[PDB]
Design a protein around this nucleic acid. Sequence first.
RNA 1: ACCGCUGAAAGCAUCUAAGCGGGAAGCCCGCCCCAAGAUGAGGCCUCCCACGGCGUCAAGCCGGUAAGGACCCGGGAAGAC
RNA 2: CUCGAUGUCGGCUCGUCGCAUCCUGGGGCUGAAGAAGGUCCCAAGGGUUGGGCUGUUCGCCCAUUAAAGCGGCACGCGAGC
RNA 3: CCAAGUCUGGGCUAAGUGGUAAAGGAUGUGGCGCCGCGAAGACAGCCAGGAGGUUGGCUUAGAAGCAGCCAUCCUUUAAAGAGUGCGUAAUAGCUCACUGGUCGAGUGGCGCCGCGCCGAAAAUGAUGCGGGGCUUAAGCCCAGCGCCGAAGCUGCGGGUCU
Lengths: 35, 164, 122, 138, 191, 117
Amino acid sequence: KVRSSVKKMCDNCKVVRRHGRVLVICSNVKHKQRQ
Amino acid sequence: PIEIPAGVTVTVNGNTVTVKGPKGELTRTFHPDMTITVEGNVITVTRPSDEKHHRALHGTTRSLLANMVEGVSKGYEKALELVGVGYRASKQGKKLVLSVGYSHPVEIEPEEGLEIEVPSQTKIIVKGADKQRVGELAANIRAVRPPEPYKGKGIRYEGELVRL
Amino acid sequence: MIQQESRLKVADNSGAREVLVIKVLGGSGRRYANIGDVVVATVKDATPGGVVKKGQVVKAVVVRTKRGVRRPDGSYIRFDENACVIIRDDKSPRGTRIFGPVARELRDKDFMKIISLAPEVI
Amino acid sequence: SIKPTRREYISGIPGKGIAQFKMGNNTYPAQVENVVEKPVQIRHNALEAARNAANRFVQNSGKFRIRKFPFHVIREQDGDGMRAPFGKSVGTAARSHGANHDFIAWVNPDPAVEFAWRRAYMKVTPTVNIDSSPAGNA
Amino acid sequence: VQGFAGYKAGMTPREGMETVPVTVIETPPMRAVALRAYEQRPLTEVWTDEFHSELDRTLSDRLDHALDIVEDGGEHAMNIFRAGEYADVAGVTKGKGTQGPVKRWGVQKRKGKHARQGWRRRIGNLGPWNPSRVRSTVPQQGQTGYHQRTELNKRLIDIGEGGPYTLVKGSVPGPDKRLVPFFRAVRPNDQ
Amino acid sequence: AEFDADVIVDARDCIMGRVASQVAEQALDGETVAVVNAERAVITGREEQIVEKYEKRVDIGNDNGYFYPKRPDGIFKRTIRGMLPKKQRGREAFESVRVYLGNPYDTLGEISETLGA
RNA sequence: ACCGCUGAAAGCAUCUAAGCGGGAAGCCCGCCCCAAGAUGAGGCCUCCCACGGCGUCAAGCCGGUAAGGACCCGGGAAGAC
RNA sequence: CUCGAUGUCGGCUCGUCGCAUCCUGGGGCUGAAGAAGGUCCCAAGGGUUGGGCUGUUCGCCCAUUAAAGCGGCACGCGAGC
RNA sequence: CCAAGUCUGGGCUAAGUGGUAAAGGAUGUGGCGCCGCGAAGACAGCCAGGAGGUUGGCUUAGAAGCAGCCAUCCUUUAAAGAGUGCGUAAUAGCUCACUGGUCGAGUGGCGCCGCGCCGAAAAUGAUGCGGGGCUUAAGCCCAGCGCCGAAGCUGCGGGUCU
């Protein structure tokens, strides 16, 4: 969502690279981190 | 770094690795952009990079291989869950005939290779020859039929949970 | 047929007399109120305060138009007049009674209510 | 570097209006602090503020000391339009000479205050440098 | 010849059950000229004279079944087109000519207070100042009457021979009676 | 079909650059180069963004038009032709070169095809 | 966009670089409308046959072949001409 | 740049781009069951109505509607009113 | 395209960056220093008990780590958990912040960098100058090498003023 400025929720929410892209991931709809 | 138990006929030509076995008749591909590894009684990883990068590159093949095998000899299995207080299924035709409202159930076919099973209407699952080609299709239906976890019911990957 | 401010009498008794045609009811664009159709107009004048009253925001439908209506029966029908009936959101008349005849129509687009009240439906 | 008209004819002799220096707590060795590298008539206000919000998030022991302070200012629109511009003041600060000793998060073992200041940098404006002092930070 | 076609009979409606207007169309089997194939090399149109008597005054189903009638000797009766079907026809506009941006192209003209002023017909404008001279956009008095017009969802209702002729569902053949009609039921949707 | 044997060449793998380059080179001087290979051809990795650029030849459509060929055939069309001008010789110099798909006379097959191949 | 499968490098996970799929009134195609003057002038069928005399690579001047066309006339929802 | 001169507001017509998208599809999100809303990512195809009072745009009001978009191009257009 | 090394040497790119941008992010990648250990046989797999006085103070109607303001100590023992954590009405389960067998040889951390991807949306139609280019493609950094190219400088010869 935040497109710009993502940084680790749940004590897990991972750091993944898709299309060089960095989009938050972690066992929660409440983390759908993306930029 | 693995093996090739009983029957694993192995032919690595051009970059293709031909593996013949029991209920696992399979012909897969395998990079020329690296180093093959086979010796008639085992086999393993070849270092056409030795460097982190390609390192993994095969650090994957390894499995890759591991697949051919276990795949060629003993086929794969995907455990599916039929969790629907209304939905339901039980093979029919050379395919499956699931149902879950709407009005028109649906007939789904496991093209040469893939093959589904109705152990008992409620639950089901697939037994192919390539974990790969399996997990996929296996799921490609597990969803096909909305698992909607709003409060519990639908096709779900074995070992799920609930919600609120 | 019948929009902006073309006028049309009553045949029911709702307590009216005549009514100005605001909008043709249906959805955007649309430019026409043809019997069966439903109009968004008001009172140009209504009896001595029966129940309606001059200048009253309103809702009425189509039943009399000298515009001539081509019946799927390659037939043709029209009238010496142009007017219709009020309604209760629920495509339901008010006039307790009818007046000049009308046309199958109505039925086809819901209204019986009048369909029969009518002295004669042509 | 345009600066003002004089220290007592235009606008010179103030308090600049702000929120004093010291906070946090002592500490003999532990060198915990912050400085910069950017040049900028440090935005007073912005300034004053910032630092403060710093205390807002911590509270006590962590040299919430801070070695800054504006003392001159700009000016602009007031009068005719754009031409012969007289001057109407507003917004004093101080030149953050391309880096230097900012404020200090100084204390034994109290990073619970390092993170703080940290929060203090985040804020600020001109980037900022996160650092330690003679020894480091313990 | 890949298709089937002839000319405009005319229009009129009448009968049915609710009633419905169509159009008449003339055409037995206008013989069969070679047939489409690009085999061994470039092949398309031959001509083993067998035509009319005057014509030298100027001297894979569709096409396939053809082979059926085009080898028979030439001609080929029209009408698979049967009871309730959708071919498509391509008339020829209609010598309507060069007209004003009026009908030629929908547009509102000279309003009121000036919707007469011995004023009238004539488009509004071209292009702005900075943009650049002109566009190939805004049509123009783009003549008409000659266009190779046609359409779709062309449903045929019935037919009979006495003279091989066809009855149509809604005319709009484009061109005028005695006119050049060609039909088909192309990528039908009503299918 | 069959022609001379003047500029007897082909393609495949190579670098879809200097490739044409000389093609012309002799494209200039005054020679005819009839080869072929298209597909086989070759050019920058980064396929992806690889097939992009020339799809930039793809839908680069300007009212005034702007076709932008859709078969290897072209790719080389552009490019090459690029090497030359547009007064006489050059031009002609564009009729004097000619290539083709598989083989008529004794990564370079994806962008095309891709955007038309 | 967005969702997945198979699995490295991170011996555990990951739609992932490489391997394979899902998914849009949208792009390409498809449906109508031109259209090779696209100087790369395209295809194909159906006609016409080697005429005269002159210096030449006379690819230049004449009767021709209704193959054939035209012009002039008479006419067209063809149309300013 | 133009005063040896670029005729300025609003309207009219004829429109053409653009996307931060109003309607429209596709998505993930929700304190989302349904339904309907809110949040934000992808997409411009097509489309986005009659009046009123105001020189006006803007704007308020009246009846619609899925919707009744923001802005370009001399806040497009006077050798077109 | 247009004249001149698809020179050689050794690094760095895997985005077409080059071919305009900032704050702000992230086991991208390559090169440098630190803390703990792998035979008290180490981080992420797996077997198991996931300790007791801890159930203290404001608010308690509920702090009793898992509302929040202050504590942060003691322990009989395999050590510790000021019990960072999902919850519910507070209590009530799991999770390491702990290690045996089975593995076994490199595993987690911050400072220093040089290269690089999200932020970075626009109106006629598209853009490195164009065709174009991914270990001489070519870019960028550090090294040697030879060629181009002005009307400038040498050779040719005339001109002309001081």
